[PDB]
Amino acid sequence: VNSFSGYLKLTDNVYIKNADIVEEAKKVKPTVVVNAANVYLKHGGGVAGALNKATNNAMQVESDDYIATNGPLKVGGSCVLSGHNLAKHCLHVVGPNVNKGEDIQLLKSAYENFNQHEVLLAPLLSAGIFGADPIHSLRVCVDTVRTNVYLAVFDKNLYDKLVSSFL
Numbered sequence: 001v002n003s004f005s006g007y008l009k010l011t012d013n014v015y016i017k018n019a020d021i022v023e024e025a026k027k028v029k030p031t032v033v034v035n036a037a038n039v040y041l042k043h044g045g046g047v048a049g050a051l052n053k054a055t056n057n058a059m060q061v062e063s064d065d066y067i068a069t070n071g072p073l074k075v076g077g078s079c080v081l082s083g084h085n086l087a088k089h090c091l092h093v094v095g096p097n098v099n100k101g102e103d104i105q106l107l108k109s110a111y112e113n114f115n116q117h118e119v120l121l122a123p124l125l126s127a128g129i130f131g132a133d134p135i136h137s138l139r140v141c142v143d144t145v146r147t148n149v150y151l152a153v154f155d156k157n158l159y160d161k162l163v164s165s166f167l
């Protein structure tokens with residue numbers, strides 16, 4: 001039993017809700033919140049810009065130190081950093097950005113990072129300003145993640161479309 005409330009169950013291990021991931025994180029304080037990161041951990045917009053704003057820019061300060069030490073992530077890769085006031089940990093995961101020409105096959109590799117964590121709160125990788133089809137992102141998620149994932153979809157219209165079209 002966990003504290004996630006109001007989710008629709010899609011499969012044995014995947015759940016979905018129309019919610020602002022920022023507000024959902026502040027209430028649940030999950031062990032792991034997933035960020036829709038880029039390789040530079042520049043949290044300017046989308047989910048990343050919103051999460052970073054909620055930390056009063058502390059996520060960005062920590063991220064800049066991480067990059068100065070380690071260099072950029074790989075597309076499809078991840079790193080674990082602090083969750084600040086939102087969660088114990090933040091798993092920064094880089095899905096391919098279609099508006100940059102990155103290979104969509106890398107989306108499965110990106111979701112594989114979730115399997116290193118028993119329970120996560122997450123957005124749909126490569127959705128939104130990353131330019132991929134969110135319906136496809138949900139399919140790859142369900143077919144790749146085996147741990148317990150709670151998906152927050154900001155747009156109510158998109159949430160309804162994702163549920164109504166889910167196979």
Ligand SMILES: O=C(O)C[C@@H](NC(=O)c1cncc2c1CCC2)c1ccc(F)cc1F
Binds near residue numbers: 050123127
């Ligand atoms: O933001 C992403 O990277 C991906 C995804 N974000 C969220 O669902 C989300 C969840 N919680 C809080 C917030 C967001 C967005 C900003 C604040 C997304 C958003 C809108 C859209 F039209 C498509 C889409 F895929």
